[PDB]
Design a binder for this molecule. Structure first.
Ligand SMILES: NC(=O)CCCCc1cc2c(cc1O)Oc1cc(O)ccc1N2
Ligand SMILES: NC(=O)CCCCc1cc2c(cc1O)Oc1cc(O)ccc1N2
Length: 329
C-alpha cells in the first residue's frame, strides 16, 4: 500500500527512538508512515549535548530514569508514560508539515477538544481560561522526504524535568496543560486510534497495524544495528569530557561549551557541546581547532574558514568568532 502504520508495544525509549530513526533514514520514501509510541521515564538530549553537565546523572540512577540521545540537535526533554508520541514521514515533493499537523488537529477535535496550531511546532487548545499548550513537536527534512515528530501531554508529571537537570547559570540569565485535565479519562490507546483514523481519513486509505517491540523486531532495514547503537551507553552518555580549559557561552541560538587542552601554546585536543539545532559547524570547528595556536586571532582564522561551508549559519558562526576574539586573551 501507500501507508505504513507502526504501533510500539514497548516502553523502551532506545527501541522507540531506534524506530523513529530507521523511519527517517533507513526506510524508503515511497510510503507514508505513522509511528505511535510512548516511553517509560526518559530524558532525551540533543546529539551534541553533554549529559554530565545537563543532567543529574546520580538522581537519574536513583529514581530509575533512562537517558537517550537523539540524532537531531536541540536541548533536553523529559518523557513519562503520560506522554504519547508520534512521528509522520512522507516522501516529497508531496509532503509538507501542514499535513501531519492537520491530522493531529483532526484527532484532537474528534476527541472533544477545540485545538488549533500555535506557531510552527506547537498545538494549543482553546479554553475559557486561555490557550493551553498540549503538544510539542519538531520537523526534520531531506532532499527526498520530510518527518514530523512530537508528543502529546495526556497525564505527564510536569514537575519531573526539574529533578533531573542541573542548573545552567548562563542560560537562566540569558500554558502547558495535560489533556486529562480537559478530557478526564483520556488514554494512550484512544489518542492512538483517533490519530490513526485521522491519518486514514486524510489519505483515503486503510492499512493494518504493524505492532512492534524488541521481543519482536520490526520490518525495517538495518534496524538491528540501529537499535544496538541507540541503546548503547557509548552513544547515549559517552565518556565525560576531561579537559584543562573550558570556554562557554549562551547565545540566542544555543549554549556552547568548548573544552580543550593547551600544550606548548597549542590546542592538543578539543571537544564542543551545544544544544543548537545545527551543531555540524561547531563539530567542524572542533575538528579545525586541533593543533591551533592558542591565540584569539588564530581561533578566528579557523572559525571563518568554514563560513563558506556553512552559509545558512553565517550569523551564528560570527557571534562565535566575535566571542572567541574577546573570550581568550
Ligand atoms: N524543549 C527543548 O529544549 C527542545 C529543544 C530542541 C528541539 C527538538 C526537540 C526534540 C527533537 C528535535 C528537536 O529539534 O526530537 C525528539 C525526539 C524524541 O523522541 C523526543 C524528544 C525530541 N525532542
Ligand atoms: C514540550 C516538550 C517537547 C517534547 C517533544 C518535542 C519538543 C518539545 O518541546 O519534540 C519532539 C519530537 C519528536 O519526534 C518526538 C517527541 C518530541 N517531544
Amino acid at each position: 500500500s501507500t501507508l505504513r502504520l507502526l504501533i510500539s508495544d514497548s516502553y523502551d525509549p532506545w527501541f522507540n527512538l531506534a524506530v523513529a530513526e530507521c523511519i527517517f533514514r533507513q526506510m524508503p520514501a515511497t510510503q507514508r508512515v505513522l509511528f505511535l509510541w510512548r516511553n517509560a521515564d526518559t530524558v532525551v538530549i540533543g546529539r551534541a549535548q553533554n549529559p554530565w553537565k545537563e543532567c543529574n546523572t546520580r538522581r537519574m540512577e536513583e529514581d530509575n530514569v533512562r537517558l537517550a540521545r537523539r540524532s537531531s540537535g536541540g536541548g533536553a526533554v523529559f518523557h513519562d508514560l503520560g506522554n504519547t508520541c508520534f512521528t509522520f514521514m512522507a516522501g516529497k515533493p508531496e509532503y509538507d508539515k501542514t499535513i501531519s499537523t492537520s491530522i493531529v488537529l483532526n484527532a484532537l477535535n474528534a476527541l472533544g477538544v477545540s485545538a488549533e496550531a500555535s506557531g510552527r511546532n506547537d498545538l494549543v487548545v482553546k479554553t475559557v481560561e486561555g490557550d493551553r499548550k498540549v503538544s510539542g513537536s519538531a520537523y526534520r527534512e531531506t532532499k527526498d522526504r520530510g518527518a514530523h515528530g512530537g508528543t502529546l501531554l495526556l497525564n505527564a508529571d510536569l514537575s519531573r524535568l526539574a529533578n533531573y537537570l542541573n542548573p545552567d547559570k548562563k542560560k537562566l540569565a540569558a500554558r502547558v496543560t495535560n489533556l486529562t485535565e480537559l478530557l478526564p479519562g483520556i488514554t494512550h490507546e484512544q489518542v492512538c486510534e483517533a490519530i490513526t483514523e485521522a491519518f486514514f481519513a486524510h489519505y483515503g486509505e486503510r492499512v493494518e497495524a504493524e505492532i512492534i517491540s524488541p521481543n519482536k523486531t520490526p520490518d525495517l532495514p538495518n534496524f538491528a544495528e540501529t537499535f544496538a547503537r541507540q541503546s548503547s551507553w557509548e552513544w547515549n552518555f559517552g565518556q565525560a569530557p576531561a579537559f584543562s580549559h573550558l570556554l562557554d557561552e549562551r547565545f540566542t541560538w544555543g549554549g556552547v561549551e568548548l573544552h580543550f587542552d593547551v600544550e606548548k601554546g597549542h590546542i592538543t585536543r578539543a571537544q564542543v557541546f551545544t544544544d543548537s539545532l545545527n551543531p555540524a559547524p561547531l563539530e567542524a570547528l572542533a575538528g579545525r581547532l586541533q593543533g591551533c595556536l592558542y591565540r584569539a586571532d588564530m581561533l578566528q582564522q579557523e572559525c571563518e574558514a568554514l563560513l563558506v561551508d556553512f552559509p545558512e549559519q553565517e550569523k551564528e558562526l560570527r557571534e562565535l568568532s566575535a566571542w572567541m576574539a574577546g573570550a581568550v586573551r
